[PDB]
Amino acid sequence: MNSDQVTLVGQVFESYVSEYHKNDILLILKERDEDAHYPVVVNAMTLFETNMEIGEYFNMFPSEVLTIFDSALRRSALTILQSLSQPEAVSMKQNLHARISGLPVCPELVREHIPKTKDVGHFLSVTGTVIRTSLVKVLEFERDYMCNKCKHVFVIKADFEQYYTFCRPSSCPSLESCDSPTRCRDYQEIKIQEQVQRLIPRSMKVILEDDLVDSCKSGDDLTIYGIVMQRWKPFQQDVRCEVEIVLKANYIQVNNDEEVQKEFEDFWEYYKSDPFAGRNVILASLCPQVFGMYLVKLAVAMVLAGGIQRTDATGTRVRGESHLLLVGDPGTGKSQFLKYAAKITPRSVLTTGIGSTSAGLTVTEAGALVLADAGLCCIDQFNSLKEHDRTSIHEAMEQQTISVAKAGLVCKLNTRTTILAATNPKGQYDPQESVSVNIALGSPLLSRFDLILVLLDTKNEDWDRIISSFILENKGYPSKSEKLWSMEKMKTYFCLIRNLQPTLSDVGNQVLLRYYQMQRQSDCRNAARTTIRLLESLIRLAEAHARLMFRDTVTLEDAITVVSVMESSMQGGALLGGVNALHTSFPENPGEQYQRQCELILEKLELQSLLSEELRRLERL
Amino acid sequence: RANYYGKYIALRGTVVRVSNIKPLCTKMAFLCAACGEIQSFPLPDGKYSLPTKCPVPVCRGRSFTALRSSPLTVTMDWQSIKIQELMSDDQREAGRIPRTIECELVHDLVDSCVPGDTVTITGIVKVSNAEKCMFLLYIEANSISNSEFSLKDLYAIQEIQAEENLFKLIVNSLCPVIFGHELVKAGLALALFGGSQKYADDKNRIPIRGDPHILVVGDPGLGKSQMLQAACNVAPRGVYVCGNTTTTSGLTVTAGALVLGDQGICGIDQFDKMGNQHQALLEAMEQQSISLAKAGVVCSLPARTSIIAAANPVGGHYNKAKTVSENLKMGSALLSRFDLVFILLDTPNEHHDHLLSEHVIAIRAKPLSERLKVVPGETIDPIPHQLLRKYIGYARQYVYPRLSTEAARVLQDFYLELRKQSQRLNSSPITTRQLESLIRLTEARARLELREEATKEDAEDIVEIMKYSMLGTYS
Amino acid sequence: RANYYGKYIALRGTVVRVSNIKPLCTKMAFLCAACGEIQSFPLPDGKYSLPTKCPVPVCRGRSFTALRSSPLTVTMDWQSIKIQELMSDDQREAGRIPRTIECELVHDLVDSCVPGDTVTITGIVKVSNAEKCMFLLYIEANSISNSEFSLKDLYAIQEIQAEENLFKLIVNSLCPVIFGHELVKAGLALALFGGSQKYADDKNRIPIRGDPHILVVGDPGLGKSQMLQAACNVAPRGVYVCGNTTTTSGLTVTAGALVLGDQGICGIDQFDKMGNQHQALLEAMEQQSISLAKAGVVCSLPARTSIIAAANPVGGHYNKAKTVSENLKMGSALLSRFDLVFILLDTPNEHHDHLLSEHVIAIRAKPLSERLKVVPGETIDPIPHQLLRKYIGYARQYVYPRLSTEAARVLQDFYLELRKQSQRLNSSPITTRQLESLIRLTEARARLELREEATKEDAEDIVEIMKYSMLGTYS
Ligand SMILES: Nc1ncnc2c1ncn2[C@@H]1O[C@H](COP(=O)(O)OP(=O)(O)O)[C@@H](O)[C@H]1O
Ligand SMILES: Nc1ncnc2c1ncn2[C@@H]1O[C@H](COP(=O)(O)OP(=O)(O)O)[C@@H](O)[C@H]1O
Ligand SMILES: Nc1ncnc2c1ncn2[C@@H]1O[C@H](COP(=O)(O)OP(=O)(O)O)[C@@H](O)[C@H]1O
Ligand SMILES: [Mg+2]
Ligand SMILES: [Mg+2]
Ligand SMILES: [Mg+2]
């Protein structure tokens, strides 16, 4: 390169670092130790837009720029030390480094796939996970060997391209014709596997150096801004030489459009007079290959909504998710719902159940529950799930954490997953002889499931004809209106409402408390659904219903909806009556039904002081 | 073997052993002695050599030093592929696997193939070294394609279509040794062709399988072990497996039997005797896919099968005065998946036994049940199985049948009187699966005659056959 | 990592891989050339070298010959130990094992450590070779010690001792989330501290264990899975293991769970599901030692554990009209070793549920049963668990309680009326273990208040907690 170019580049970086990076260098100067290591973080877009010439000089030879910036940082530190007013609690350090970040979003610099052979000497950005990890080891850099046959000492260095080997020199750079270890560094070796979510992918062997050692973990998402170079091997006569692709790291990250919003507020601002029309439209687009079955489709959305985790200070943490289980005669559509819900959720694992061994349901290696962190694992054929395995999940289903010390290793892992289940009612189902009798599951397990919906096929002469016409005429989506919704829109909708944190209110909790106190003993209090875990779920479902309607303040409507749904969930013994889930259709007008439901609920449980306020609010809208 | 050395030829096969990538160098540069003028010797096929002479202007050569950093060095990709050659012909009884030859992709290729294809490869044939004058054979690829019937095959299939009674000729030629059992052979013929696949609502699809499943149950000695051998023989891809030498690890993926029977039939014998693998194929046959058997850690593979099973009652001979449920040892889950479960009986008649004895000694020297029976005094010469094999392949990839408005009414009416009648009586519960099965079987009787319609007679012919495991039999 | 090269530092850790002993030479001699004058070149750190020059009187050197028999050569011992660092701080959720640094002992040391210790090592840091410019890090020992609280720790523990009601502030601080269940928390607090170990008759001893064992049995949903988590958290050394993924080789030495939880808590959850490993712990918790599991060929190792277990009745909910033995599915051998077995019931009250619901919705926004409760209207701010963790350590190795004459009379009296009433009534037989357990627990109620006595109310506080699994509950 030209002599003036590097000088101008160094001037640019030193000016930028002196203008925008005084606090960090001041902090770095005021530290103990003399010569260990100290990095500096510098953004790229700002200095790229400050001068147009630096970018062209940078993104063609990404080797000299780092050294020039290191020299600029050194001279800046020297200048600051010279112009210092408190030279007592300060120390001068000879080891500085550079770390650039904030690369543009150009398609050819944010490539997700590993380059084949075309990117050598190009600055790239890759993302992926971690598989293997080596040990901390120390290299030798430079020797300063004894001077032979001459006087001036030699400062020969090592070469990276030859696996850190040393070549014996014989031609001295001496002016005349006469021609004849307290240094340490750091090292590591890591393997990166490309993610499958955004895609079998191959592996990238990344090499770390200096401070980057002991800064990565197995099983985390990484983003490295490194250079791509080639590593050779010693040559053998009359064979095929071997090469490899590596990635020298220069920076690391531990990371783990207004149009979509504007569309969402347009949608939930148009539906202002009628708030339940939006909810009806949301529920209709779920699994639109099935006719009817309002309650189950609402329950699936409520379960998939989620909740918030609330951990106490010292040791304890409570559950913040929900679980669902369905029972019914074969041929009702249980598998369709699981298949459809296995796709909307970003991360989901589909398993057979009885065909899955103990290596998946628990830890062995990662199984199924641990592998589905922050996701949803679907469970099928729960009738005979290998009773040992069927009972060895009580710990991880309620405490969200496994605690195993098999073979004297003492390993602890985290698992937070919503479980969906569907099993056949072995034996001819009866209206009486509650689920604990027909399916014969233990009471401790038949308490952690929030909603248990029962499906029964009975004698009717209308639903059969409607479903026969639906199947035969091939009338996909009988509502020919072009509202629908695409699957990507639903995925974005359910991936965006997970960020809101609703807060409880006073017109709310009183209703749930009175309902729980009333239900704790009416005349039979069932046998297993009247424990303390009932109220712990009545809040998690009422809160989840509030995150599907774009708000963060629970009101009377959410409480009424959740109470009605959960009361309908409890088959047989109840306080209003049981309604079959399958024989339910979308109401033509939801406002009148909501008003009737509120008037029916708020009379026998004495909260009449709220009914007047609610009717006044409903009238004035 | 020997002669085809350095001669351009062409091949055809599949891919099973796609490997990783690793670069290689072909024109890496060398250092120069004395003066400058470096050079870029064309090193051949990745074998290190030395420039014993250098052209240069003048003087001596040598200059034996490597300079593997200059931009003069050029690199390119590499790959390795193994090809297994198809069944083709020469059906020798020996269990010798077909020979395999390796392939090498040079540049701008790679990631153009996936495990399992049908590819045509043309390239030069060279000889490797150091697998010591002991070498092997491998081919350097030059062009790759991706994805055929002869003219005579077409002429034959049009003449076969030209027959006046195509259904009789194909139902009475599957197995001519066995006498009688018209309806079971008709059901097997219907199963061989198959139905259509529905991709409705492309954005989410959730596809539904389009093939039937038939189980045969009856007394021993009726001959229900050769109607299946012939059916397995006449198929583009088939496999026959017993019910005692296989386990859960055998039928499913560990490449199981179901995977090998993709787009074909995987008929299983001695079905009743299984007692531990019953709950291992419900997911596979219904989900139309199978996942990994190691803790269920994704890695799913397609498995399209048309499983055909034959079994005997639990107590040997089946007595006539009991209930049907206890004589099969099957739950309500696995008994409803199958479309047709034929029940056969052995009764001591007079005329039928006489005719059967006459046939079995001579070999060693209107409802849809009589129009198919052969009245003696005519020639019903069967089509060779070799020609019938080439017919199914043409049928299954050039015609996609669909239902018509007229035919759907009959199926709907049948379903309506079936449900309202059997919802009170005691029998297997009738779900919505039977409505889909009737559609699938009506679609099935449209690929045998090479048509794309649904006539009223088409739907009427799937009513009489259905009344052989349903109501027409439970009594 | 890099900077500390050849710099004197100090360490602290545990020893786990004591190795064998093999000698090495440092002052080996060499032969001389021409004339005599054998020399004793200083060979450095066991690396063979050659004396290219010999001082001698005059003339050439060479003399490259070994003479490894003269008494000039000396030999010295050697060893190799690895050290793993303690938990210390930085409680990251990541499961990375602490870094291990090797150690080397030179002379006059060796046989100074055994597997399992707390040692401080000071020595120079050096770099090895030939694990090729690739090396590792190891430390040459210079001095060894064997086996501390800061002054602020003494001040803090003194201030906590200065509390006016020390019992309440520790019984209502183990887990503040759970409402109610005061007696079980008191029992857990008593078990956490422990008692005294009796070495009576030192010449033969036969030591008797000096720690209790607690079991909790009750209906599901009462919260008996977090009071144990909190108890395990506040301990100098604690391990928590489920009862499902562990086998006989897991709990016992195959390094089992019990040996790892030496001098601490090894709480086990889901105790009822175990049906095969029951008979593998009676010896372990009774004899206070465990031998080898390979044919029992000696090789014993200490294991002091304070097992805490929580279990579920066999029939889910526990019915109120049955016998106690059938609702537990436990014999008379594994039911008598435990000192206390709390039985909890779930009944639908009107005030308790009203208060509990208010507490659980607010969190998301005289006999020894009333003096421990907290009435509304005052602050009971708990001690942070970090400070309480360092209090048990001081209370465990600086105070040894001893029974007094006055307190023994009450225990003897209680045992006397217990025996004459268990003679006739039906219950678990009252063996001689009850008196020893009462002595152990009365000793326990002398270590929480940091005292060495046994006064009357100390012994009276143990007759009321005892009446919650005994007679006070059998009805
Ligand atoms: N409302 C409906 N509309 C269309 N098809 C349906 C409907 N209900 C059920 N089905 C059919 O029933 C099948 C569902 O079977 P399913 O009951 O999930 O099996 P399993 O009992 O093994 O879970 C689907 O293939 C679907 O075609
Ligand atoms: N209709 C028939 N014509 C000629 N042979 C028959 C007929 N039915 C049965 N067989 C004879 O019975 C044998 C088949 O026995 P099979 O009934 O398949 O045994 P399994 O009941 O164990 O399957 C064949 O060898 C065949 O010769
Ligand atoms: N007194 C209480 N106060 C607050 N939460 C409670 C109380 N009792 C039980 N819980 C709730 O019950 C859960 C504990 O369940 P638990 O009864 O330990 O299950 P198991 O019976 O299987 O051990 C906790 O998450 C907690 O939130
Ligand atoms: Mg299913
Ligand atoms: Mg057979
Ligand atoms: Mg527990």
Side-chain angles (χ1 to χ4, degrees), chain A residues 35-36 214 217 314 403 517, chain C residues 1 3 96 133 240 354 385:
Chain A
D35 60 37
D214 197 1
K217 189 59 63 179
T314 187
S403 61
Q517 293 179 356
Chain C
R1 306 297 180 63
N3 303 108
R96 155 177 59 212
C133 294
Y240 181 72
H354 176 38
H385 277 175

Side-chain angles (χ1 to χ4, degrees), chain A residues 82-374:
Chain A
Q82 188 263 5
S83 180
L84 190 60
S85 176
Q86 303 289 100
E88 51 267 13
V90 286
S91 61
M92 180 34 88
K93 304 174 296 295
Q94 197 44 266
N95 271 43
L96 274 57
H97 293 285
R99 263 134 192 76
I100 62 170
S101 180
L103 198 68
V105 193
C106 290
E108 72 271 10
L109 275 76
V110 169
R111 189 174 327 104
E112 173 60 11
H113 295 92
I114 301 309
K116 299 295 289 184
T117 182
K118 180 62 220 73
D119 263 348
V120 172
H122 278 204
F123 203 74
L124 188 60
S125 167
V126 71
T127 47
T129 186
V130 176
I131 303 299
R132 254 181 70 191
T133 293
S134 66
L135 297 174
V136 169
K137 293 186 286 185
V138 165
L139 277 296
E140 183 178 1
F141 182 76
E142 191 178 3
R143 330 182 59 79
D144 278 340
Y145 61 82
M146 72 291 291
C147 201
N148 60 5
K149 204 171 71 68
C150 53
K151 276 74 69 178
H152 54 302
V153 76
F154 293 99
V155 293
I156 190 65
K157 306 160 79 72
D159 189 358
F160 177 81
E161 270 190 323
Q162 312 210 21
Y163 274 143
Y164 287 164
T165 199
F166 268 119
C167 52
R168 187 83 265 161
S170 182
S171 66
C172 301
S174 70
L175 188 152
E176 71 269 11
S177 89
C178 179
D179 291 329
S180 67
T182 69
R183 334 299 310 280
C184 279
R185 295 261 286 282
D186 292 331
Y187 201 89
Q188 196 94 340
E189 171 156 300
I190 175 159
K191 281 193 55 154
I192 298 186
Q193 167 87 349
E194 288 206 28
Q195 284 181 352
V196 66
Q197 172 168 60
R198 37 173 42 94
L199 277 180
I200 176 168
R202 63 181 175 90
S203 53
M204 201 45 257
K205 190 162 76 172
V206 176
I207 171 172
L208 274 47
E209 198 167 357
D210 194 357
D211 296 337
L212 274 299
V213 70
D214 197 1
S215 187
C216 183
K217 189 59 63 179
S218 300
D220 291 331
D221 294 330
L222 270 299
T223 302
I224 297 169
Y225 294 160
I227 300 169
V228 181
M229 288 186 328
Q230 281 169 5
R231 292 213 276 184
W232 287 94
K233 212 167 278 292
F235 285 116
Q236 204 67 286
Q237 179 58 267
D238 291 331
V239 298
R240 263 286 167 81
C241 59
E242 295 85 1
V243 306
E244 204 62 31
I245 300 305
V246 298
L247 183 63
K248 183 162 79 72
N250 205 57
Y251 189 49
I252 200 166
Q253 197 177 1
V254 185
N255 193 2
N256 56 3
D257 178 38
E258 311 311 279
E259 182 65 26
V260 180
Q261 285 94 18
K262 298 213 94 63
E263 165 64 76
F264 277 139
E265 292 84 4
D266 291 331
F267 181 75
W268 273 102
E269 190 276 331
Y270 178 34
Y271 293 99
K272 169 58 212 73
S273 181
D274 291 331
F276 282 160
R279 190 194 57 153
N280 267 12
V281 176
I282 297 169
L283 288 180
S285 294
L286 271 171
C287 59
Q289 296 173 356
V290 181
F291 182 76
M293 270 165 31
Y294 185 26
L295 286 181
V296 176
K297 263 191 291 303
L298 167 65
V300 172
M302 271 205 298
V303 164
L304 194 43
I308 56 176
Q309 65 182 357
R310 283 271 151 81
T311 183
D312 204 277
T314 187
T316 61
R317 78 183 300 180
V318 298
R319 209 181 51 223
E321 272 74 19
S322 184
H323 320 270
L324 183 63
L325 187 150
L326 313 159
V327 294
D329 291 334
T332 54
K334 318 161 162 63
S335 178
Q336 300 285 80
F337 285 12
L338 277 298
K339 174 72 71 63
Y340 182 76
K343 281 186 304 316
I344 301 176
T345 289
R347 293 202 201 121
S348 67
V349 285
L350 193 147
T351 190
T352 293
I354 307 163
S356 164
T357 69
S358 165
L361 285 194
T362 54
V363 70
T364 309
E365 311 215 358
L369 294 181
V370 64
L371 183 63
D373 194 1

Side-chain angles (χ1 to χ4, degrees), chain B residues 369-407:
Chain B
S369 166
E370 282 146 340
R371 316 203 279 95
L372 278 299
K373 193 170 69 177
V374 188
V375 167
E378 67 181 1
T379 302
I380 52 180
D381 55 355
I383 190 167
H385 281 172
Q386 188 273 331
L387 293 172
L388 184 45
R389 165 148 41 190
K390 190 62 64 67
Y391 189 75
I392 301 299
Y394 179 80
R396 291 179 66 189
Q397 74 162 41
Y398 281 104
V399 164
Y400 300 77
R402 84 181 40 192
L403 179 57
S404 166
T405 63
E406 313 183 300

Side-chain angles (χ1 to χ4, degrees), chain B residues 99-140:
Chain B
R99 76 175 189 176
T100 61
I101 182 150
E102 310 295 327
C103 316
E104 166 178 290
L105 295 175
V106 56
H107 180 215
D108 314 288
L109 271 71
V110 176
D111 269 9
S112 66
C113 295
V114 65
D117 292 309
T118 307
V119 298
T120 53
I121 294 190
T122 66
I124 313 169
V125 175
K126 284 203 241 213
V127 169
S128 165
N129 192 0
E131 61 89 20
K132 195 62 179 176
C133 59
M134 222 75 58
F135 322 117
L136 277 74
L137 294 171
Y138 82 107
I139 291 171
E140 160 198 345

